[PDB]
Amino acid sequence: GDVEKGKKIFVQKCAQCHTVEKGGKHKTGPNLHGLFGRKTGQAPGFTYTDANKNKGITWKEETLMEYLENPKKYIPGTKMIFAGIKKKTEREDLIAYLKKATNE
Amino acid sequence: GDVEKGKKIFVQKCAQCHTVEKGGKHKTGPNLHGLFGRKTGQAPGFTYTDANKNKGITWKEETLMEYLENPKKYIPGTKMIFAGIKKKTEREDLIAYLKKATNE
Numbered sequence A, B: 001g002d003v004e005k006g007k008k009i010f011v012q013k014c015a016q017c018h019t020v021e022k023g024g025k026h027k028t029g030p031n032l033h034g035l036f037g038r039k040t041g042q043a044p045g046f047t048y049t050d051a052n053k054n055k056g057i058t059w060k061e062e063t064l065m066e067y068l069e070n071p072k073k074y075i076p077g078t079k080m081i082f083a084g085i086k087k088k089t090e091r092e093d094l095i096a097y098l099k100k101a102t103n104e
Ligand code: HEC
Pocket: A010, A013, A014, A015, A016, A017, A018, A028, A029, A030, A039, A040, A041, A042, A043, A047, A048, A049, A051, A052, A053, A059, A077, A078, A079, A080, B080, B082, B085
């Protein structure tokens, strides 16, 4: 496998949701450091879907190859969920901005 | 509603997938200009999910307040699916980079 190319692909298709650095922060997705040898859905502090939580497989070259070709196929139920906004005043302020900008 | 606050929220939580300016572009999500007083899934040239496409309700403060607190709940089926990496060589390259970066 070609590392330099893989780095570019990661930066374009994955970096937006995942960090790989040790101690890396969780974003939309979980930090991926120490991924090889780790079972699905074990990154401490992250909230996985039951699908990702129960896949029951170990991440490594082979599993990643199948998974990466089509995530939903390998782990039916895996998806990105649009983060809700629980605070009422925040939703009110956001809508006020939306009402103005989407109409100007 | 506090426009100034909504503006910051929008930019930090929504701008990455949505643009609101008239003639704006579609990103991971559709441009939201003209959103109010119009039914769901009406953005020209954007392919929504059947879920978002058939919610049928009309966007306005009321409906937006309920939707924003929990998208999935107000529109069962709305989500983002993880795109696969069709090219076998890219998957290999990506995996090599991950193997390097997640251990170092
Ligand atoms: C956000 C829009 C993401 C993009 C783009 C990518 N992934 Fe992701 N990934 C994301 C989340 C929120 C999740 C968990 C979803 C769930 O079902 O709970 C994941 C998970 C993974 C995993 C598994 C991690 C684990 O089990 O600990 C891997 C290995 C993974 N994603 C890899 C990955 C790569 C390499 C991406 C680009 C090709 C990529 N993801 C993009 C969110 C997002």
